[PDB]
Ligand binder design. Structure first.
Ligand SMILES: [Zn+2]
Ligand SMILES: [Zn+2]
Lengths: 50, 50, 273, 50, 339, 180, 45
């Protein structure tokens, strides 16, 4: 979704923002991986269980 | 600071009222190890055990 | 010599090295290093080869008197290198077209359209061509706009004084008269030459030379036709008349189509009852 | 937690210290990926994700 | 609160003993109470909060300063400070002012690296968004924590306190020794970390420091050249003095360039020069214009002969823009006929 | 001391009456800068100093390269003359001064870390956006440019008396944190 | 005041009112607190 948000302007193509912009959703694996083990409720969107 | 005003040059730190935590207990106890430290987000974590 | 801790805090450190005095600030190898050998060694090398690359670009831009066409010639040379890589690593041009007949086939050739289920199925193409090694470089401090210039040629200065004696402060014509420079840098050249010299510029504005050799250079070095104001004005009037006739014909065709649609609606109302 | 030029993390935050600091005991991810950076250039930048 | 029966307006104290904790008065003793009883635009601000969350978790800042930047952006949008931007520069500028409130280590290049925007336009919008402050009290003149936290990802040492404390000591002594006023805090951090690493028995490649510190290669060499110029650097090789006395003879080179300022190649209100007398002499007549005959009024225009050649040059060169303008007018007067 | 600033450049404009046209008379001349960009205006003889300024938007051309009001209105005397050489009205209406730039140096530059640490109500000192301090004086409406080098340069003023009252009222502030 | 014992090399450092709390040459983050110099009293029961 971030890639599709960037590639939508007549500017030069995405050289370094692909090299960057991985430590902007890097706090989605860490925060979720800590929250699901510090709470104990694992919401999954492909097996449909709690 | 419980609300959100602007950071004006008016006195924000104008009162330092006392709201500590107190040892509510039936019997007297002692303190053997008190430490002040840092957490993830650069704030003064303090742990004390009695 | 090598990386070894010779000495410190007493004198010039010399245990196993090639140093014989203090104040090693100039090149700043002193004791020894054991961190980031090759990835920091192959960074100034990459910067130096890119600077020599831009210098040989500036040298090649003198020959072909078209800047952006020299840039497209550079990318044409690198895509010649890309088709050389297509010869190296690998028909091969498996792509689509403006129509639906893409492949091999347009459809089945036995009895009818058999491969229309496969022809109706862009992102499967040839891309494994351009392979280049990686780095961990940087472009920070200030990146974006700028000006890559040089110490200017004195023959270019003589040509500029002869031009200003012949055809004066004409910024677009001066930018076209040097067709491998650019516009803002020659404006800085205008204010720089306006700074230092009153005598030859005053004699240049005294001269009033007629512009024939300037048009000679602009028609040879650019190979532009330069059709006169009567021919270009007649061509512009003919284009405007053709556009007005096309617009009037489109309006008349739209009115005829609306009349045909009204007649078809009246016929459908007559056939409904 | 490899970092295959230097050692594993060069700290890899110590466990009993991490229990008192109110930090999660962790070691990061390291991946290797391509791009489509230039018109004829593909980078192989080796980044971390969370 | 001052509701009582025997006294008025006294202090109070909830009980600690007997698990009873009622709010009671003093010096007579009356509970004086009962028992204790204990237990549209929002979518735009949501998009702004998600973008601020992205830039916050990308720029490695804590969670309270995210809410501080959020309430700062809310106050600024209540003052109607900007509209219609790409919002990357806006969120970066708001997080930059909320981040340069605190003494943490984030410069302009850490924000200019995101979205590949030039740093000067971001600073220009940062000085456009100060049309709300009229306070502008920012403690910005302390590059001391830059030395403390740049030395973690660059200049890796076994100790990292012996290089770092002497680095920040020498850098503050040099900044107080007239070498820092608008003089590149990241650059002086790189310079007084390369110098302190040179004091240590370990060397660095010069590219490795200037790569992640986002500073140029030539400017830090100019800095170290000025360190060689000012400090004698004979005692600096072995060990610095424990009692450093530095008084006088301290200047940036702007003082030198004003000391030479070329190259050879009784205050009174009436004694000040008045400026209205220059404008009062020359006439304000829109009809009188012929008093400038100095060979310039008779040399503006030439004849018709060497003018159609200029028209030929103009129509030959500046042709495509005129054709696109006339064709755009034809495109308009085509597509405005219908509805 | 009792030094005086020397001016650098002034920029103003003048309003004319009719609809101007500088596409044919300038075409019969020496120089013409036909601009395909936004500012479609030609310039003849830019180089001759304090005689000819540059581009007009709708006729109200700016003043470029003038210091005193003699040469400013003398150049403005030479502009409506060209517009009447075209054959138009060219009224000289509403000559209003908008910008007077002055530069000076007190030769003894001063510290700015204390002038930015304590006197932060009238200034927004930012180090590496631009090394010179931006001094926001509110009386009058003049944004001064205090420099680290000490060459004090003023801009944005409309009167010379405003420049004198802005520079005289800052010299005790320069003498407050005075370190040679 | 001589307190705030370290937890890695046990150094007696006295931090100021603004420190953003940090240790000494051990290179540590947390720190304990030294025992008070008063006279604690109780029976041996
Ligand atoms: Zn009472
Ligand atoms: Zn320790």
């Amino acid at each position: 979704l971030s890639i599709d948000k960037v590639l939508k302007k007549p500017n030069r193509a995405m050289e370094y923002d692909a090299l960057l912009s991985i430590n902007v959703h890097s706090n989605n694996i860490t925060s979720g991986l800590n929250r699901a083990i510090s709470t104990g409720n694992w919401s999954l969107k492909r097996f449909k269980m709690e | 600071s419980a609300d959100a005003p602007n950071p004006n040059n008016v006195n924000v730190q104008t009162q330092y009222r006392e709201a500590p935590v107190i040892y509510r207990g039936p019997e007297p106890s002692h303190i053997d190890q008190v430490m002040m430290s840092v957490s993830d987000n650069d704030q003064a974590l303090i742990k004390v055990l009695l | 010599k090598k990386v070894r801790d010779g000495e410190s805090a007493k004198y010039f450190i010399d245990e196993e090295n090639f140093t014989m005095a203090e104040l090693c600030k100039p090149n700043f190898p002193i004791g020894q290093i054991s961190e980031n050998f090759e990835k920091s060694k192959m960074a100034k090398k990459a910067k130096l080869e890119k600077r020599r690359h831009l210098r040989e670009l500036r040298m090649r831009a003198r020959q072909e008197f078209k800047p952006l066409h020299s840039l497209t010639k550079e990318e044409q040379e690198e895509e010649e290198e890309k088709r050389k890589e297509e010869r190296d690593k690998l028909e091969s041009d498996r792509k689509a077209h403006t129509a639906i007949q893409l492949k091999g086939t347009m459809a089945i050739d036995e009895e009818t359209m058999v491969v229309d289920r496969h022809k109706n199925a862009e992102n499967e193409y040839k891309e494994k061509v351009d392979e280049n090694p990686f780095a961990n470089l940087y472009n920070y401090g200030s990146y974006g706009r700028g000006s890559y210039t040089d110490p200017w040629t004195v023959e270019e200065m003589i040509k500029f004084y002869k031009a200003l004696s012949m055809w004066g402060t004409d910024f677009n014509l001066i930018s076209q008269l040097y067709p491998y420079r650019s516009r803002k840098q020659v404006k800085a050249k205008f204010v720089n030459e306006e700074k230092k010299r009153p005598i030859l510029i005053e004699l240049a504005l005294r001269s009033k030379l007629p512009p024939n050799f300037d048009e000679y250079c602009c028609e040879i070095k650019k190979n532009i036709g330069t059709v006169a104001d009567f021919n270009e004005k007649l061509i512009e009037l003919q284009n405007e008349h053709k556009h007005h006739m096309k617009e009037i014909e489109e309006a008349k065709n739209t009115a005829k189509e609306e009349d045909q649609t009204a007649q078809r609606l009246n016929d459908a109302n007559l056939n409904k009852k | 937690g490899k970092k295959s030029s230097s050692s594993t993390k060069d700290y890899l935050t110590p466990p009993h210290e991490c229990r008192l600091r109110d930090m999660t005991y962790s070691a990061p991810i390291y991946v290797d990926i391509e791009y489509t950076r230039g018109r004829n250039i593909i980078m192989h930048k080796d980044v971390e994700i969370g | 609160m001052p509701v009582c029966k025997n006294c008025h307006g006294t202090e109070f104290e909830r009980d600690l003993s007997n698990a009873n904790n009622d709010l009671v008065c003093k010096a007579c003793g009356v509970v004086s109470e009962d028992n204790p009883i204990v237990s549209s635009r929002e979518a735009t601000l949501n998009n702004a909060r998600r973008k601020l969350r992205a830039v916050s978790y990308a720029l490695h800042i804590p969670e309270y300063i995210t809410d501080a930047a959020f309430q700062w952006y809310k106050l600024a949008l209540a003052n109607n400070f900007v509209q219609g931007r790409r919002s990357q520069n806006v969120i970066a500028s708001c997080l930059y002012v909320a981040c340069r409130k605190e003494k943490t280590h984030h410069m302009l290049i850490d924000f200019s690296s995101r979205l590949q925007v030039s740093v000067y336009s971001i600073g220009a919008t940062f000085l456009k968004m100060v049309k709300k402050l009229h306070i502008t009290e920012l403690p910005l003149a302390d590059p001391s924590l830059f030395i403390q936290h740049f030395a973690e990802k660059l200049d890796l040492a076994d100790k990292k306190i012996k290089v770092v404390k002497d680095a920040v000591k020498l850098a503050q002594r040099m900044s107080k020794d007239w070498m820092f006023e608008g003089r590149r805090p990241a650059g002086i951090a790189g310079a007084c970390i390369l110098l302190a690493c040179r004091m240590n028995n370990l060397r660095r490649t010069h590219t490795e420091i200037v790569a992640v510190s986002h500073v140029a290669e030539e400017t830090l060499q100019q800095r170290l050249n000025e360190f060689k110029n000012t400090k004698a650097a004979k005692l600096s090789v072995q060990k610095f003095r424990e009692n450093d006395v530095e008084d006088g003879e301290a200047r940036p080179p702007s003082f030198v360039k004003n000391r030479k300022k070329e190259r050879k190649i009784p205050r009174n209100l009436h004694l000040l020069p008045t400026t209205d007398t220059y404008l009062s002499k020359v006439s304000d007549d829109p009809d009188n214009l012929e008093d400038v005959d100095d060979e310039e009024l008779n040399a503006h225009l030439l004849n018709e002969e060497a003018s159609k050649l200029k028209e030929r040059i103009w129509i030959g060169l500046n042709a495509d823009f005129l054709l696109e303008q006339e064709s755009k007018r034809l495109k308009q007067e085509a597509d405005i006929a219908t509805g | 001391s009792g030094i005086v600033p020397t001016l650098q450049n002034i920029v103003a404009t003048v309003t004319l009456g009719c609809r101007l046209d500088l596409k044919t008379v300038a075409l019969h001349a020496r120089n013409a800068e036909y601009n395909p960009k936004r500012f479609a205006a030609v310039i003849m003889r830019i180089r001759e100093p304090k005689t000819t300024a540059l581009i007009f938007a709708s006729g109200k051309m700016v003043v470029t390269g003038a210091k005193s009001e003699d040469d400013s209105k003398l150049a403005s005397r030479k502009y409506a003359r060209i517009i009447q050489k075209i054959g138009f009205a060219a009224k000289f209406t509403d000559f209003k001064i908008q910008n007077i730039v002055g530069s000076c140096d007190v030769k003894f530059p001063i510290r700015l870390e204390g002038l930015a640490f304590s006197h932060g109500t009238f200034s927004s000192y930012e180090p590496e956006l631009f090394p010179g301090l931006i001094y926001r004086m509110v009386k009058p409406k003049i944004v001064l440019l205090i420099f680290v080098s000490g060459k004090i340069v003023l801009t944005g003023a409309k009167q010379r008396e405003e420049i004198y009252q802005a520079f005289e009222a800052i010299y005790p502030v320069l003498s407050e944190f005075r370190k040679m | 005041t001589l307190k705030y014992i370290c937890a890695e090399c046990s150094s007696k450092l006295s931090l100021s009112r603004t420190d953003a709390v940090r240790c000494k040459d051990c290179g540590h983050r947390i720190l304990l607190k030294a025992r008070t110099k008063r006279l604690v009293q109780f029976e041996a029961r």
